[PDB]
Scaffold this active site. Structure first.
Site, PDB file in Angstrom:
ATOM      1  N   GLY A 292     -37.420  54.951 -35.874  1.00 19.37           N
ATOM      2  CA  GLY A 292     -37.020  54.306 -37.221  1.00 19.37           C
ATOM      3  C   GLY A 292     -37.326  52.876 -38.039  1.00 19.37           C
ATOM      4  O   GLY A 292     -37.551  52.345 -37.014  1.00 19.37           O
TER       5      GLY A 292
ATOM      6  N   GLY B 125     -36.152  50.319 -41.345  1.00 12.17           N
ATOM      7  CA  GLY B 125     -34.921  49.599 -42.512  1.00 12.17           C
ATOM      8  C   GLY B 125     -35.716  49.068 -42.965  1.00 12.17           C
ATOM      9  O   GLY B 125     -36.520  48.723 -42.873  1.00 12.17           O
TER      10      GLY B 125
ATOM     11  N   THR C  44     -35.439  45.157 -43.126  1.00 13.79           N
ATOM     12  CA  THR C  44     -35.823  44.448 -42.726  1.00 13.79           C
ATOM     13  C   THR C  44     -36.507  44.401 -41.328  1.00 13.79           C
ATOM     14  O   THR C  44     -36.516  43.270 -40.980  1.00 13.79           O
ATOM     15  CB  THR C  44     -34.685  43.626 -43.176  1.00 13.79           C
TER      16      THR C  44
ATOM     17  N   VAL D 112     -35.851  50.516 -36.526  1.00 13.21           N
ATOM     18  CA  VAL D 112     -34.068  50.678 -35.280  1.00 13.21           C
ATOM     19  C   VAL D 112     -34.633  51.500 -34.183  1.00 13.21           C
ATOM     20  O   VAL D 112     -35.705  52.862 -34.435  1.00 13.21           O
ATOM     21  CB  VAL D 112     -33.452  52.440 -36.277  1.00 13.21           C
TER      22      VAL D 112
ATOM     23  N   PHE E 280     -25.171  55.718 -31.957  1.00 16.91           N
ATOM     24  CA  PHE E 280     -26.256  56.098 -32.673  1.00 16.91           C
ATOM     25  C   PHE E 280     -26.011  57.552 -33.259  1.00 16.91           C
ATOM     26  O   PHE E 280     -25.075  58.270 -32.821  1.00 16.91           O
ATOM     27  CB  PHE E 280     -26.855  57.034 -31.511  1.00 16.91           C
TER      28      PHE E 280
ATOM     29  N   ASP F 284     -28.698  49.189 -52.534  1.00 16.63           N
ATOM     30  CA  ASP F 284     -30.085  49.808 -51.912  1.00 16.63           C
ATOM     31  C   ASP F 284     -29.764  51.701 -51.728  1.00 16.63           C
ATOM     32  O   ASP F 284     -29.591  51.964 -50.640  1.00 16.63           O
ATOM     33  CB  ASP F 284     -30.578  49.238 -50.833  1.00 16.63           C
TER      34      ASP F 284
ATOM     35  N   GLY G 259     -29.207  45.487 -44.868  1.00 14.59           N
ATOM     36  CA  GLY G 259     -30.349  44.433 -44.947  1.00 14.59           C
ATOM     37  C   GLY G 259     -30.379  44.755 -45.878  1.00 14.59           C
ATOM     38  O   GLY G 259     -30.220  43.280 -46.648  1.00 14.59           O
TER      39      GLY G 259
END
Ligand SMILES: CCNc1nc2ccc(C#CC(C)(C)O)cc2n1-c1ncnc(N)n1
EC number: 2.7.11.1
Length: 291
Positions: free
Chosen positions: A30, A32, A34, A37, A99, A142, A162
């Site tokens: 992924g 994110g 900033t 991942v 995870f 967020d 973040g």
């Protein structure tokens, strides 16, 4: 020195060493706030962890990197992604964490129709996390379906801190234009001093995602959407007739323009709509592999 200063500052908070020497078999999963991942294998134990990787040189605002490692340092809650360690790897800050195998809520809301039992379960979980976060003066800033991750057995965790921020007696309110446009609180778009209340509005928008499959104005350019959020009445559900009076009343406490009248997380935990909340097992059939 600018770059060198951020590095040295990070060095004073992260754990020592290069975690690459202890991890095998990286798989990008992924992107994110900033950084990206990835997951990987802890060699000594056979366990899988996720890692968020944030390049110092690719930041619009480098000081944001302090958020997970300072504000969120050793924070523990059943509805918050558990972070294990942090490291400085070249110019990248790495945060190593558990995870979450069920992926993100976004994949669910874009591909299926959640029932109110499932919606209530998600809200309850997020509100539990928020009441505790808000109590400590942390604003997430967020909240949206992307920020919600799931276990295989359907437990819900708040993710990606973040962009979070700390308020206190000395800094009672934040002022920065932070978030994702379609989910932003009106007072935050209006650039007024704001607090934890903004997370509550954003959750309201995430409820609209869960019902409509997307936030309001989603097909508009982001700047226009913000103008529309700022200037108009609270957004309506496209599928209002598919929503119970209980869900509507609940949502009506969230999407309040005046943040002083907006319900708080702690208040919302008492709302009758949340009595509908199903168990972790109720969420399971929504996940990609199960549908
Ligand atoms: C849906 C792709 N997975 C994913 N994207 C993320 C973005 C940010 C953070 C994040 C973050 C923090 C908590 C460091 O603020 C975590 C993400 N994950 C993910 N997926 C599975 N397990 C885990 N742990 N994470």
């Amino acid at each position: 020195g600018s770059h060198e200063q951020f590095r040295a500052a990070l060095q004073l908070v992260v754990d020592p060493g290069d975690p690459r020497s202890y991890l095998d078999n990286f798989i990008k999963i992924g992107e994110g706030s900033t950084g990206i991942v990835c997951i990987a294998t802890v060699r000594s134990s056979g366990k899988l962890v996720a890692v968020k990787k944030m390049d110092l040189r690719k930041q619009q605002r480098r000081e944001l990197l302090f958020n997970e490692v300072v504000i969120m340092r050793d924070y523990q809650h059943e509805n918050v992604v558990e972070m294990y360690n942090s490291y400085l790897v070249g110019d990248e800050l790495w945060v190593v964490m558990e995870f979450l195998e069920g992926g993100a809520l976004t994949d669910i809301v874009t591909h299926t129709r959640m029932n109110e039992e499932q919606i209530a379960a998600v809200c309850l979980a997020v509100l539990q996390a928020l009441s505790v976060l808000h109590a400590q003066g942390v604003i997430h800033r967020d909240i949206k379906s992307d920020s919600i991750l799931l276990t295989h057995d359907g437990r819900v965790k708040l993710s990606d801190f973040g962009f979070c921020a700390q308020v206190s007696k000395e800094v009672p309110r934040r002022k920065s234009l932070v978030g994702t446009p379609y989910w932003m609180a009106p007072e935050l778009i209006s650039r007024l001093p704001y607090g934890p209340e903004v997370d509550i509005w954003s959750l309201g928008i995430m409820v609209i995602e869960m019902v409509d499959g997307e936030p309001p104005y989603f097909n508009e350019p982001p700047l226009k959407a913000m103008k529309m959020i700022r200037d108009n009445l609270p957004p309506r559900l496209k599928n209002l007739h598919k929503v119970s009076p209980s869900l509507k009343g609940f949502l009506d406490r969230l999407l309040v323009r005046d943040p002083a009248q907006r319900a708080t997380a702690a208040e919302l935990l008492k709302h009758p709509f949340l009595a509908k909340a199903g168990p972790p097992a109720s969420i399971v059939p929504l996940m990609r592999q199960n549908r």
